[PDB]
Structures are given as C-alpha cells and as structure tokens.
C-alpha cells in the first residue's frame, strides 16, 4: 500500500 501503511 503506502508507507506503513496504504491509506496515505
């Protein structure tokens, strides 16, 4: 996804 996670 994104960094750390995908919603960013």
């Known amino acids: ?3 750390x996670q ?3």
Do not use: F, Q, S
């Open 1 to 3: 996804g994104c960094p």
């Open 6 to 8: 995908p919603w960013c």
